[PDB]
Amino acid sequence: EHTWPDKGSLYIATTHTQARYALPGVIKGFIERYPRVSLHMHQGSPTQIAEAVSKGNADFAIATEALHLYDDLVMLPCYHWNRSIVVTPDHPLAATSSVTIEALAQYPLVTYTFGFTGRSELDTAFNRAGLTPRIVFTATDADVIKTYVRLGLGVGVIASMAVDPLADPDLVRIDAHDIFSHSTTKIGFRRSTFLRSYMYDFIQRFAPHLTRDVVDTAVALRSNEEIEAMFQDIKLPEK
């Protein structure tokens, strides 16, 4: 009843951050439309995620590993995203008129770890202002991080999508898009993967600008550089 009868396997290798905040909608949508597609899902670190799809278990990889050893696979820009700073309401940073990277910094921090969902600005955006802050905590998911900010171990820096005013009503969102450059989530797959219609539909459902035609031409280029050139004048979804 309003479903495609397409039969086939779809194996995704993705990160926590992706699996938790960016993927659920799509997946629920997808699996409802394709009851004959065996959707398998495997979470993990950028290198294994690179490894899995590369040679050669999973069909797609979904991650902010704009990082390398990715050349084998066709990488496609999906969206940008940045970070919010979260604190307990009783924090000095709460009652502050737009904080700076130096105004941060004076504090002990609970961030992500490198490399795993873009802390690849943190430190490398800190040494930039010649700064080195106390990182009392590095983790891989925001929910752990959030709960340790509730403890008061330090100030947290997480993806803006990882704050949910509903889910997180004991924290203060402070947007830091000014403070840190955005991160790009891409989607990979090796050239030799035959692209199935459900796959295009999935790509499309996850990144609206990635239509069959866009996709095809992006893979017609011999480079991920060339691809990112293709979109350098396309405004991505900003998440």
Where along the sequence are the contacts to a second copy (CB under 8 A)? 16, 19-20, 24, 27-28, 31, 38-45, 113, 135-141, 143-144, 147-148, 151, 153
**Cα radius of gyration rounded to whole Å, the chain:** 19
For a second copy, the closer of residues 24 and 92 by Cβ is 24
Residue-wise DSSP of 118-148: S-SSTTTTTTTTT------EEES-HHHHHHH
- Considering CB distances under 5 to 8 angstroms, the limit depending on partner class, which of a second copy, ligand OAS, none binds residue 206? ligand OAS
Which CB sits closer to ligand OAS, 51 or 143? Answer: 143
Q: Is the distance from CB of 183 to CB of 114 less than 8 angstroms?
A: no
CB of 86 to a second copy, least distance (A): 16
Nearer to a second copy, 50 or 214 (CB): 50
Report which of 211, 210, 196, 209 is spatially closest to residue 11, judged by C-alpha positions. 196
User: Left (φ > 0), alpha (ψ -120 to 50) or beta: where does 98 sit?
Assistant: left
Q: 3-state SS of 147-214?
A: HHHHHCCCEEEEEHHHCCCCCCCCCEEEECCCCCCCEEEEEEEECCCCCCHHHHHHHHHHCCCCCHHH
Q: Which is nearer to a second copy, 19 or 163 (CB)?
A: 19
User: Which of a second copy, ligand OAS, none does 80 bind, CB closer than 5 to 8 A by kind?
Assistant: none
Minimum CB distance to ligand OAS, residue 97 (Å): 28
Supply the minimum distance, in Å, between the C-beta of residue 110 and a second copy.
Answer: 8
User: Where does this chain bind ligand OAS (CB under 6 A)?
Assistant: 21-22, 25-26, 161, 206, 237, 239
**Closer by beta carbon to a second copy, 144 or else 230:** 144
CB of 28 to a second copy, least distance (A): 5
Residue closer to a second copy, measured from CB, 25 or 56:
25
Contact of residue 31 among a second copy, ligand OAS, none (CB under 5-8 Å per partner type): a second copy
> Where does residue 41 rank: exposed (0-12), middle (13-18), buried (19+ CB within 10 A)?
middle
Distance in Å, CB of 213 to a second copy, minimum: 30
Give the SS3 label for residue 102. coil
